[PDB]
Amino acid sequence: PGQQGRISHTDLVIGCLVDLATGLMTFTANGKESNTFFQVEPNTKLFP
Amino acid sequence: THEKWAFDKIQNNWSYGENVDEELKTHPMLRPYKTFSEKDKEIYRWPIK
Q1: Terminus-to-terminus CA distance in chain A, angstroms?
Q2: Which of A46, B27, B30, B43 could form a disulfide with B16 if both were Cys (CB 3.0 to 4.6 A apart)?
């Protein structure tokens, strides 16, 4: 919230992790793990 | 007007100071209202008169 309100100067990196054995989906932002996750079904095709 | 300029400057990450600087972006104009100066107030209020 402090940074929001103008133009920053540091790039934002978002990482997405896929587990092909249990169908777990996680997302990390700048090395910080988010609190949002997704669950998929076996035999599911996903495109980045 | 003073607080609008101050907000624009803190958008640029300015800081309060005594002397005027360019790289240090310090100025005595970023001060609380309870400790302003008569000269600065007169200069700021002159244009609207």
Answers
A1: 29
A2: B30
